[PDB]
Amino acid sequence: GGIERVFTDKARYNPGDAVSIRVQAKNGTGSSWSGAARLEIFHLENSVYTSSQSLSLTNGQSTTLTFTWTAPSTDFRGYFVRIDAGTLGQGATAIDVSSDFTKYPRYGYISEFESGETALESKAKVDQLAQDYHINAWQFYDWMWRHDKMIKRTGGSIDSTWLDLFNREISWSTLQNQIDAVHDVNGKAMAYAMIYASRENYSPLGISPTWGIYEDSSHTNQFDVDFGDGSTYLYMFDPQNPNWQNYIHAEYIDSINTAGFDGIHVAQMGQRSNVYDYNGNSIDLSTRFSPFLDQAKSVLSANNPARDNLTYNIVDGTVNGWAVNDVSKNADLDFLYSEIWYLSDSYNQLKNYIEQLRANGGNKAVVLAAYMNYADNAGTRYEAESASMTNVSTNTNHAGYTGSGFVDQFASTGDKVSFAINAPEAGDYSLVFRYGNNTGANSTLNLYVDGNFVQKLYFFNQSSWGTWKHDAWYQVPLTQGAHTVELRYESGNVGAVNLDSLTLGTFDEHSVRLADAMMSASGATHIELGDDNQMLPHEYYPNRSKTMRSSLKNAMKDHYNFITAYENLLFDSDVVPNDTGSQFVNLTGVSASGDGSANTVWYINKRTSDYNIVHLINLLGNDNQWRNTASQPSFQTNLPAKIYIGADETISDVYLASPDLSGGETQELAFTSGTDAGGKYVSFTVPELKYWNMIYMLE
Ligand SMILES: OC[C@H]1O[C@H](OC[C@H]2O[C@H](OC[C@H]3O[C@H](OC[C@H]4O[C@H](OC[C@H]5O[C@H](OC[C@H]6O[C@H](OC[C@H]7O[C@H](OC[C@H]8O[C@@H](O)[C@H](O)[C@@H](O)[C@@H]8O)[C@H](O)[C@@H](O)[C@@H]7O)[C@H](O)[C@@H](O)[C@@H]6O)[C@H](O)[C@@H](O)[C@@H]5O)[C@H](O)[C@@H](O)[C@@H]4O)[C@H](O)[C@@H](O)[C@@H]3O)[C@H](O)[C@@H](O)[C@@H]2O)[C@H](O)[C@@H](O)[C@@H]1O
Ligand SMILES: OC[C@H]1O[C@H](OC[C@H]2O[C@H](OC[C@H]3O[C@H](OC[C@H]4O[C@H](O)[C@H](O)[C@@H](O)[C@@H]4O)[C@H](O)[C@@H](O)[C@@H]3O)[C@H](O)[C@@H](O)[C@@H]2O)[C@H](O)[C@@H](O)[C@@H]1O
Ligand SMILES: [Ca+2]
Ligand code: NA
Known part of the structure; x- marks a missing residue:
């Protein structure tokens, strides 16, 4: 849709401050449009505010609405903000009321x-x-x-x-x-x-x-x-x-x-x-x-x-x-x-x-x-040996290079390597070169983007010609479409590098x-x-x-x-761990684990005075390291869950919120509780798991 942005003026508010919620909208649907924008604010499962404004827009035109709201008096509270504009679309943001x-x-x-x-x-x-x-x-x-x-x-x-x-x-x-x-x-x-x-x-x-x-x-x-x-x-x-x-x-x-x-x-x-x-x-x-x-x-x-x-x-x-x-x-x-x-x-x-x-x-x-x-x-890779090189040639005689090889003896005036890259969307790109240098000194090279000199880049001396580094980079603004990225050795540059690849460095x-x-x-x-x-x-x-x-x-x-x-x-x-033996979690059809094991759905148990909180993190299809790159997880839908609880506790309601689903809106779930040979439980169907679900159950 065309609710382009929803945000507030301030990053944090004190109790009683005036909050200005902004909704940026653009009718993209083909013709003119008449409806309302309905604002609702929740503290957890509860609706604390609701408001509506009329809105009509000739196709293409944009506008910005402002809803005002007064931060409630209870200090240190967080709030979910929904904006629903019917068929124009929806959007969300959030608000933090804390004096510190x-x-x-x-x-x-x-x-x-x-x-x-x-x-x-x-x-x-x-x-x-x-x-x-x-x-x-x-x-x-x-x-x-x-x-x-x-x-x-x-x-x-x-x-x-x-x-x-x-x-x-x-x-x-x-x-x-x-x-x-x-x-x-x-x-x-x-x-x-x-x-x-x-x-x-x-x-x-x-x-x-x-x-x-x-x-x-x-x-x-x-x-x-x-x-x-x-x-x-x-x-x-x-x-x-x-x-x-x-x-x-x-x-x-x-x-x-x-x-x-x-x-x-x-x-x-x-x-x-x-x-x-x-x-x-x-x-x-x-x-x-x-x-x-x-x-x-x-x-x-x-x-x-x-x-x-x-x-x-x-x-x-x-x-x-x-x-x-x-x-x-x-x-x-x-x-x-x-x-x-x-x-x-x-x-x-x-x-x-x-x-x-x-x-x-x-x-x-x-x-x-x-x-x-x-x-x-990490990012899209353009191998250097699959590029356009002048006065330098490929080779394979130092291990660890990616692809079929790398360019070597990139070492004197006139040498050149030009990459034909494509930017999938307008913006900044991190131009990252993987290289080798064992000349016993810093090697330089001039960088040119679509024919214009952008920067002289340094390539750091390493211990050995077999030690690949990739910390020569420069960031540049790029328009969507084709571009040319060129390292030239010119008169003023020094040393020499082998060149394995250029990468559009991407988290x-x-x-x-x-x-x-x-x-x-x-x-x-x-x-x-x-x-x-x-x-x-x-x-x-x-x-x-x-x-x-x-x-x-x-x-x-x-x-x-x-x-x-x-x-x-x-x-x-008052948020604390609740992983004190009395609580397993069952999921039908997929491997679950309490210690975040590779290729599982990880459950973590925390609690407060009023809520039983179970997080699901979806490690299905991925290893157990936090820092390294990773593939889309195995998304799941209509996933049966069973939560063994304490023998005493009583669940009023079951709520699930996820950043991955509807901007984080809380959705209440239907659940039946009985009891079986191996604990007292409650059970429900999880509509969807992509990366992270937080289940909070009110007792
Ligand atoms: O293609 C690459 C770029 O090429 C051109 O620019 C190159 C540089 O040009 C000028 O410098 C000229 C000199 O260049 C060399 O300088 C030698 C240094 O470079 C090598 O290291 C490579 C790494 O460089 C960066 O990392 C810098 C540095 O970061 C940390 O240390 C600094 C930090 O130290 C304390 O803080 C530590 C730490 O404290 C914790 O508590 C905090 O949590 C944490 O946040 C803090 O980091 C101080 O208190 C801080 O004030 C201070 O900031 C890190 O710890 C340290 O290891 C690291 O080296 C890059 O980020 C990284 O990617 C590279 O790996 C050498 O290895 C290093 O020993 C040496 O110091 C030559 O050797 C000289 O001869 C030459 O004269 C600029 O001044 C530099 O900024 C440029 O990098 C292009 O112009 C550029 O466009 C290209 O991108
Ligand atoms: O006294 C140090 C002087 O040399 C330094 O520069 C080193 C070389 O830089 C470029 O070559 C890089 C090159 O280095 C290795 O291979 C070099 C030798 O290996 C082959 O056998 C080759 O046939 C010979 O020509 C060469 O002697 C790496 O394994 C290779 O992949 C790298 O690409 C220059 O082309 C060489 O001429 C330099 O020797 C220093 O930078 C100089 O300033 C010093 O004068
Ligand atoms: Ca390569
Ligand atoms: Na990982």
Whole structure:
């Protein structure tokens, strides 16, 4: 249909605020049209509001309706929004009423701060994320000048621009425009800062090496982070040291009061061991973040209670992981955040780590960084040996290449490889080259798109000609249809590469839908969206080596509506596991599992004071890894389910909501309860399972 968009002005509302629901419509049906748009808002199974407006439209013409509504008085509630326009079509969105984003955070990011970005454009990228996904907080990533001197001043004046550690130009006015825009959607701005990093040559800033942490007991090698140009490093300091606290806390305060941030997103480099202080005592670094964090929270709350938000990145998250118990149990954080690497690879493992962080933290919110399809060179592939190459030829003499071979000796002026690609729809494309380089140095090549120079791309030296990487990419705007993408070796380029393929880097809808379901069904959200509708492909946020296509965009809008509409059932302080032995689940005709086994329908049991909640995630046709790409699941329809309950509980009604079905609208189901040789039960037909169903049953 032609209900093109439904969204609200703001990403979160306080009780009593005025909410402006917008419906964008275009009659596409051939002739003129006369009917109504009927608005209905639910809190879970209940209708709390209904309203209707007349609408008529000459074929082709568009309009935007506004329905007003007043956020009800109960704080911390989520709502589903339906708009039904009869034969024009329907649409949906969702609304979050919370006076504090820290209970139901929907965390995005901003990582680009160019001088050329107008106030209007800053506002647009922000509105888009607020409107489509209800993003209520933004992590400002790599905005600071130095990790130990965050705002660059000349005497007493703020410098209008400054260069960051990777040489990017950061504009003050742009950062401020973006912070303003975040604030205009009732968003909050969290500033990225390390817990313990200076930059090189820190002495003249009055930072003392006595505050540092060392790899020896003789204070000769301070832990660093080498960015590999003989010049740019981080150095690491002791969280517990009072003079480092004093120094860096002061920089956090400076950033709140000068930039107008609402909090600090505190980061770290993850596990280090056999760590010493300056003098030489050996110390367990794992236990030392919480006293820093507690003290940081204290000066931030004293400085300004409204701009004192605080989280800390727990790196390498897993059950009983490094620093996992101490930080989640003892650190005065508003919400928990954890970047996942390789110690929770299965849906069920990460599911358990999330549960640990919910239980340790006292059921305060949990956000995961968990870069989807990280290792995968996912998307449509144009093999390099099936392209048009000038002065270079194919070969097969280094293993692991894809297809029938790869292009080699791409190594001198005049060499060329031109790909004939097709863009299935207008938009941004991630042009990703898989390559080899063992020249012992960076190899370059110039990139041309439809005959116009776009960028000189670097190809990184690897260990061995048999080590394929695919981290040479550039993102570009493309019109639907044919295009030409050409690497030329010209005069100014250096080195040499073998070239395996070009890929239109694309997040895989299927994996992405399934991981988000798993995450939120478990009790967590996912920092995955930012800047101008980008999805996060790597720890360095300005990476655009993969793009979303339109189909996944729509799925993400459904998902983010669903986790806002149903947040009381997903993340409330009284949502807990209910997997305590008394509850099996039966599904007729398909394999089911409670531990998220490959090729099954996974059921997860959670409960609250009033509802028995069973999630189904559909792993049929797919493996049990959360991060990797995946095929469409085996969709199911009219699927008999049987839920064994507690011997005591009594089910009034059975409800099923799914982001995959009607935008997340709750549909009530008919169910018969009896009892049999192997438990007391209830039973019903599940109309459909695609990726994720949430069954909530009211007792
Ligand atoms: O075709 C490719 C592109 O080619 C051109 O641009 C190339 C670059 O050009 C300029 O740089 C010139 C120099 O280029 C080389 O630089 C060497 C570096 O590159 C290699 O790494 C390749 C990866 O590059 C990116 O990843 C960067 C970086 O990200 C992280 O580290 C940075 C991060 O560190 C801390 O934060 C860590 C972490 O903290 C956690 O708590 C948080 O959860 C998490 O979010 C944070 O990430 C700091 O606190 C942060 O401030 C900071 O941001 C990551 O940890 C690190 O490993 C990673 O390297 C890409 O995203 C990725 O895809 C690549 O794999 C080397 O391997 C690396 O060692 C080295 O540092 C040459 O060696 C130099 O000689 C040369 O002078 C630009 O400055 C660069 O931005 C360009 O990439 C085209 O112009 C471009 O269009 C093409 O796309
Ligand atoms: O002292 C280092 C100098 O060489 C560096 O560049 C290395 C080569 O770069 C290009 O070739 C890349 C090529 O490398 C391997 O094969 C090289 C040899 O292997 C074959 O036997 C071939 O017949 C010989 O010509 C060649 O010696 C990979 O296996 C292959 O797939 C790669 O495509 C140039 O074409 C070569 O001339 C270079 O040797 C460095 O970059 C230079 O600056 C240094 O002078
Ligand atoms: Ca190939
Ligand atoms: Na998988």
